[PDB]
Amino acid sequence: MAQDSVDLSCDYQFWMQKLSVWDQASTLETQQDTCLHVAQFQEFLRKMYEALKEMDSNTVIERFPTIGQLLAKACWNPFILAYDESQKILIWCLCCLINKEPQNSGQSKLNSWIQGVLSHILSALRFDKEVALFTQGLGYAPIDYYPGLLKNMVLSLASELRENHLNGFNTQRRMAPERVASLSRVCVPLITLTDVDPLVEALLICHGREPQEILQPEFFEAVNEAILLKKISLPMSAVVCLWLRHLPSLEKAMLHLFEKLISSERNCLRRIECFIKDSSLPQAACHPAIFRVVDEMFRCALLETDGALEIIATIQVFTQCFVEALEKASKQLRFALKTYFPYTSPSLAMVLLQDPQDIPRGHWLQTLKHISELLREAVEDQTHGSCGGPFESWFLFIHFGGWAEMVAEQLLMSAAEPPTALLWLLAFYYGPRDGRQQRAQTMVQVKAVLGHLLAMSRSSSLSAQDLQTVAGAPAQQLIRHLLLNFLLWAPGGHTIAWDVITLMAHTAEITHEIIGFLDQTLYRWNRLGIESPRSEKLARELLKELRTQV
């Protein structure tokens, strides 16, 4: 409540001047232009309907001057009439603009002009003369075959364009790409129209042979949007070859993953496994290109946030589903992991691919303790014939959910004599790039706190201030995450949980951090199937109650 007519009356003159440009878009550039700006045209029209809905017809002269000619130009233009609900809307507009009882002949003339326009849309013979005669005589009205007709036209092109493929350097009718171009402008308006899917399919598979692209990215971006809103649902082959030939669509699906994990669905990792699997990304990711590019946008987020736990969780989900779509389709002929993660030891990956479901709960210490020892050699003995640097060996460790998180919960279970391997590992996780001086200090601060906590676990259910003393710095997230582990693991927990949570949740940041922690812990458990029902119900309750507090 501020403007009313002003922004709308400006964008009106923008659009009215632009519709007079395009005018039935029987050329290439009239079409590209229409092709792009259409979406904003749609929103303009929603605002325009609200404006026309609230008031009544023939009475007001707000933009009634030229609205006739605006909606004429709009209508006679078919590149508009293919976009989502634009046609229903323009109808809603006209429904306002009619009068039931026209009194001055101007209103009647408009109403007649609107019956004209509606018939022009709905029931007009601006198609091949012979077919009209034939059908009218046969005794069809256009409606009842328009469909099969259409589908036929398509399957002609569909099939025909498929042939253009098969003739990879044959002395034959090379279907001139200007037609290809043409269609691709026609598919963007109507990606949402069910009776064209196949066409689309056979443009996005049969690239053929040209040095250059021949489609326009107005098309590659149209495809993207209806995929990730799931308003076309293509076959998987279609969409890999789409990524593979317009790289900024692939970047732009990955953003559309980030906003899920950042804005809308903070820490609903079942919905995030849902989104990764119902994206075909794991799939596309079988392909050494696509995964290398993915990992690098994953790398640029790992830096701008200095290790968001929530971004790390979405990597652990990506790897998860990558591995087991890689696994699947790769018996003969898959690309060797020095190809996917080329910046580290093949050895270490080959260890860390081995999933913990298919290991005893007892042989997890063994496994972890060995991983850490080789990591110690790859980072600390940064010699010729190793990683570039530590960063890359940590980036290896992240991708693997299970291993990174299980160190802590296994330190509690070996609190009596903590293994130095795990201490070093864990301080490496919560802080890489330290200097060995700093890592020794981190390990032994943790060892002191292992003494205090083991004394407190073997004692009765005690206060929370005794714990916040040991908590009281640059190793804070190390200690907090270990202490939450303590609360959920020990049977003394489920009692003085709230006492510690309320103290540690200074800010909202800490709360959101621990929500992500809990969802990760629980997705990890439910996956590996491993539970004390105490800790399950407790974590669920605390997660539920904290998501109101924030």
């Binding site: 990879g168 898959r334 060797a336 060995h370």
Partner: protein, 370 residues
Amino acid sequence: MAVTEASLLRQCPLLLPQNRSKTVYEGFISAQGRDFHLRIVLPEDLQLKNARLLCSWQLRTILSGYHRIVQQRMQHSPDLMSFMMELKMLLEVALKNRQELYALPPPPQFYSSLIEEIGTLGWDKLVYADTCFSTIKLKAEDASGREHLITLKLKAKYPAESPDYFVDFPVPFCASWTPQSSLISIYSQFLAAIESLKAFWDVMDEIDEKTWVLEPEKPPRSATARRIALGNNVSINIEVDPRHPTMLPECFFLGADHVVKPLGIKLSRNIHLWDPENSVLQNLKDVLEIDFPARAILEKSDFTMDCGICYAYQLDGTIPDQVCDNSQCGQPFHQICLYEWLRGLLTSRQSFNIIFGECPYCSKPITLKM
């Protein structure tokens, strides 16, 4: 210059206007240390839309299949000047492609110095020289008594620029080339690279002796990969990092999904019982707790009984069925793969519901009846 009064002279010295009305030029055009006859008539106006241009036969041979190119250029070049530019560019291309015909080397240095330097090496080492004396190929012996070859490609001036060096072994070869450096210097470097990857070779030797190596046959020294079959109808591909060979490799399993599980599990269990003092096999036998078979079948080891396009058995119920009428190929295919192959090629010709056309591998007549 801007104008083709001075820019022309400066860019085409040897093209003389015979005529006062500067309409007939004749003489030579320059290209790559080599000057060639050219006879370039204009009409009454300065229009290349109609112009005559003849060569010596020496030039027409050298603008083999750019003939149509240059006719197009004449109709769509604005100026004589720009047309000459395009032409010289176009020669440079022709000669840089056909660089096999166009040496005079500088003998006094070249051929003598090569004998000098090969003498310095010793006469046992050389194995092939091509008669253009371009390619020479040399032989080196490991401590382990294994032959490794080195190709050198030599340029017009060997001692000035680097020779191009092509060699087998799997990490990228580095040759410190100076104008002072010579064949013995690159020789020493090559011996250094041999002794460095020595462990990788002992490991690959050991594998190829004790085991049913399957998928590389007479394997090169290049290969890092060794698809071992073990017992029967199950196989493991082992890819080893050359600098740390003895280190655990990435390894994974083909065969029966039922038979793959327990092995894939026991690997998971026993992986921390890897050790780099014992060999790859002496770690694998005690990790997977098995023996391998010592060439379980050495004749019908395995024939990739696969499509030879898609490299899969079972494409949509189709088997590798469609074959070559040839003793030396015998490569199966699928109907679908082979149809989409031969129909794309220009060579193949299509009868009613048959395609006669070249086998992909051996280029012999193969027929497909849909």
